[PDB]
Design a binder for this molecule. Structure first.
Ligand SMILES: CC(C)=CCSP(=O)(O)OP(=O)(O)O
Ligand SMILES: CC(C)=CCSP(=O)(O)OP(=O)(O)O
Ligand SMILES: CC(C)CCOP(=O)(O)OP(=O)(O)O
Ligand SMILES: CC(C)CCOP(=O)(O)OP(=O)(O)O
Ligand SMILES: [Mg+2]
Ligand SMILES: [Mg+2]
Lengths: 221, 226
């Protein structure tokens, strides 16, 4: 039957544009509309959570023009999802983002927190290393103030401290043809089924998603 | 095509498909398992010839305790054969995972194999035995908490580089992960260490995995090298 939580690595947007002879920014403008479209399709099929990798903690090393474009563009989050019926959370280091963007994100989380349908977790300035490190520093802090012991440290305690919460992804889908997780949900993908496709994210449609879910259903866990 | 000068330095290996391979020939599950170490040993020899410096192979996970008591006890007793298999191989052998939850007899087989092969200057084989990714991260974290509370480090020293040194599987991390048996998951293997690792999944069952399948994986890896 249906995977309840799908993790999504949204790769291939720049290649999509360059191969078509478009400006790289054209690739990026399909990001949120496409993701929204996948949320609608996934919602009808009975999927409960999508966790989508939009910007990793390593993407600051991209060309300043592209980083600047992406950071302005990410402010369009509110228009795309405020009135969508999707419940939106952002994970990742929000305090590094421009303050306009931090406000925009907080507004989107606030306005959509009552929504009862699909939960979209957007990873923005996120990395798996980062997630495990903030968890660890929170666990150390508490041990230094006698709020927990060293024998209390277990899988469950970590699942509490991490930003991406249980239940973990059933299926991970990565577009763009690369076969890596690129510092996405490291701890959380321990038993996740991986599906890699050469299809670039702006080309990823309803049939591509169904092909992926059909592929997942055939696998014995 | 295989570029000798661009060999991955570290290959990780999920040795899956042993039970199915046996049952696909109607044999008993135990007969599949007996191929594990001889195959692994052959893969080391092949890999050594190519210039690969490290292999980390998943032999038994922290979840595999949930299996059939007879399968588990046969595995634990079979694992003691690592000394016979590897002590004269020329491979340097290390084990990662929770040694003290194993049968004491196997703990001593391990210690002797590590001691016996520690002077070997070629390929380094790391056998992950009663290991998991969660386990590695949790044990690193306990270690860091113990140091924190004994004044041995500050909470401010907690960064990626620190975690790299506390984890059992060390730098350099795997360039390439090979999983036999057709499943497309990492099954709680080297989670932190696989953050940028290229994944290669093959339907070939582990006991049928040969030099050609390995070379195919490496060529594959070299054509998607970023
Ligand atoms: C949206 C972001 C920052 C990354 C995924 S798309 P991309 O920028 O990596 O583009 P390409 O993979 O290079 O096609
Ligand atoms: C080497 C060990 C202990 C497990 C991997 S082989 P396996 O028992 O999982 O065999 P199957 O996946 O069931 O074919
Ligand atoms: C969509 C996303 C930010 C995750 C993929 O990120 P990336 O392509 O920038 O990192 P890689 O070069 O390792 O693939
Ligand atoms: C080789 C290995 C110990 C990992 C694969 O075996 P496993 O049964 O622990 O993991 P799976 O249940 O996903 O097959
Ligand atoms: Mg990319
Ligand atoms: Mg298996």
């Amino acid at each position: 039957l249906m995977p309840k939580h799908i993790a999504l690595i949204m790769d291939g947007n720049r290649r999509w544009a360059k191969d078509k002879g478009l400006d790289v920014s054209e690739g990026y403008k399909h990001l949120f509309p496409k993701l929204k479209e996948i949320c609608d399709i996934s919602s009808k099929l009975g999927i409960q959570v999508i966790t989508a990798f939009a910007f990793s903690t390593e993407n600051w090393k991209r060309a300043k023009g592209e980083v600047d474009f992406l950071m302005q563009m990410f402010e369009e989050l509110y228009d795309e999802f405020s009135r969508s019926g999707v419940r939106v959370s952002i994970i990742g280091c929000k305090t590094d983002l421009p303050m306009t963007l931090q406000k925009c994100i907080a507004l989107t989380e606030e306005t959509t927190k009552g929504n009862k349908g699909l939960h979209l977790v957007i990873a923005l300035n996120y990395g798996g290393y980062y997630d495990i490190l903030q968890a660890t520093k929170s666990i150390v802090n508490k041990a230094m103030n006698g709020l927990l012991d060293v024998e209390d440290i277990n899988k469950n305690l970590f699942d509490q401290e991490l930003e991406s919460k249980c239940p973990n992804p059933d299926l991970l889908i990565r577009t763009g043809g690369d076969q890596r997780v690129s510092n996405f949900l490291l701890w959380q993908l321990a038993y996740t089924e991986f599906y890699f496709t050469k299809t670039l994210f702006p080309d990823f449609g309803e049939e591509d998603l169904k092909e992926a879910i059909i592929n997942f259903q055939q696998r014995h866990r």
